[PDB]
Amino acid sequence: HPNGYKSLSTL
Amino acid sequence: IQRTPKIQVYSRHPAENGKSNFLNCYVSGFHPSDIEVDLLKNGERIEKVEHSDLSFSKDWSFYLLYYTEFTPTEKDEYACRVNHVTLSQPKIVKWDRDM
Amino acid sequence: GSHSMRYFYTSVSRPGRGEPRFISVGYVDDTQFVRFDSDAASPREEPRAPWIEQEGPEYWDRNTQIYKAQAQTDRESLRNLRGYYNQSEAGSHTLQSMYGCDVGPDGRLLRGHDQYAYDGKDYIALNEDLRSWTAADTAAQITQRKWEAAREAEQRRAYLEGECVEWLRRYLENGKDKLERADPPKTHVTHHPISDHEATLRCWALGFYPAEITLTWQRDGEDQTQDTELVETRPAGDRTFQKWAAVVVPSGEEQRYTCHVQHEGLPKPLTLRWE
């Protein structure tokens, strides 16, 4: 299962 | 950073003339990820060639397996042609069934 | 034994095609089981190992959405990265992400990972305590300040200590047939003459999983550290791996040379000689 939590976190 | 591709050409199973097999071209250690890979049968590119999903190693360099179904023979020569930004001209590596 | 789940993202910006190409692959140990490619006709997560096919439509739909949002986020990360290094938009640049968890034989978390590379060089990484980052750069120090203010590490920890391990245990159980398996190499030596007095002995390991393996040639029990030709371990295309090692030996004395194969699926290393 991929980490959906960080899918909005930009560098 | 730029890294040149390592290339191996080989069969899935021990070559047997008349037996269907898979011809593989394994490209690895390269960066950036754009890469051109053809499989050649007597110098002409094979049409139905699939490849694996792009992944990369622990040093971040990419790898890919290009492969097609084939039936080897005494006379027929197989090879792999690779171009990459780090290569001045295409690189061709011939298939040796003992390697 | 010990096990790992890992996801690999690659994002490649394209100068006039506004969105980057985004590819993800997911692995349990050395078994690829999912993929996503933003360049497909209809991008969605797809199964790549048999034991993941039984997952329901909500598994695929949710993961597809996760990748779609991650692709857009990567797109914006790439701009921010170009801004941090004063690179022009017309360039093509690469952002790779690697994360996941390791579990021991009991299924307890051993270690979490979450790190990034920009154009192939380490950029920022979550530390082993899952509460801090190591920045490799002045640019990555900007990302660190932002992720410190956002308490990003605590979000990575939530996943790595929670659902990451939880789904890995579920996969190991669903693909127990092929994941608790270690397939030992089936091995043989071949003989290839060079001249009247020289010959190559080649030690073959075929059909083994996982990829980690050591082949070592010995003459009279002495390791041939130099004088051994070794190819990189390579995929057979059927989720097993191949590798060989070779020595050039004097004709007549081939039985003095012995090949040792060590692999996770071999409780005792195999010793091989021609024929």
Explain how this protein is built.
Chain A has no helices and no strands. With 11 residues, chain A is low in regular secondary structure. By secondary structure, chain B is an all-beta fold. Chain B has one domain (1-99): Immunoglobulin-like. Chain B has strands at residues 6-11, 21-30, 36-41, 44-45, 50-51, 55-56, 62-70, 78-83, 91-94. In chain C, a hairpin with a 2-residue loop joins β11 and β12 (222-223). Chains in contact: A-C, B-C. The B-C interface holds B 1-3, 6, 8, 10, 12, 22, 24, 26, 28, 31-34, 52-56, 60-62, 65, 67, 98-99 and C 8, 10, 12, 23, 25, 27, 32, 35, 37, 48, 92, 94, 96, 98, 117, 119-122, 190, 192, 202, 231-232, 234-238, 242, 244. Chain C: Residues 1-275 are extracellular. Chain C: Its main location: membrane. Chain C: Residues 185-271 form the Ig-like C1-type domain.
Percent of residues in β-strands of chain C: 35-45%
Which outline of chain C best applies? Answer: elongated
Broad shape of chain A: elongated
**Individual helix count of chain C:** 4
PDB class: immune system
Keywords: HLA-B7 HLA B7:02 MHC Influenza B nucleoprotein, immune system
Assembly: trimeric
Entry title: HLA B7:02 with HPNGYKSLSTL
Summarize the structure.
Chain C: Its main location: membrane. The complex is a heterotrimer of chains A (about 10), B (about 100) and C (about 280). With about 10 residues, chain A is largely without helices or strands.
Protein topology:
The complex is a heterotrimer of chains A (11), B (99) and C (275).
Chain A lengths: L11
Chain B lengths: L5 E6 L9 E10 L5 E6 L2 E2 L4 E2 L3 E2 L5 E9 L7 E6 L7 E4 L5
Antiparallel strand pairs in B: 1-2, 2-7, 3-4, 3-8, 5-7, 6-7, 8-9
Chain C lengths: L2 E10 L8 E8 L2 E7 L8 E2 L9 H28 L9 E10 L5 E10 L2 E6 L6 E3 L2 H12 L2 H23 L1 H4 L6 E8 L4 E11 L5 E6 L2 E2 L5 E2 L3 E2 L5 E10 L6 E6 L7 E3 L3
Antiparallel strand pairs in C: 1-2, 1-5, 2-3, 3-4, 5-6, 6-7, 7-8, 9-10, 10-15, 11-12, 11-16, 13-15, 14-15, 16-17
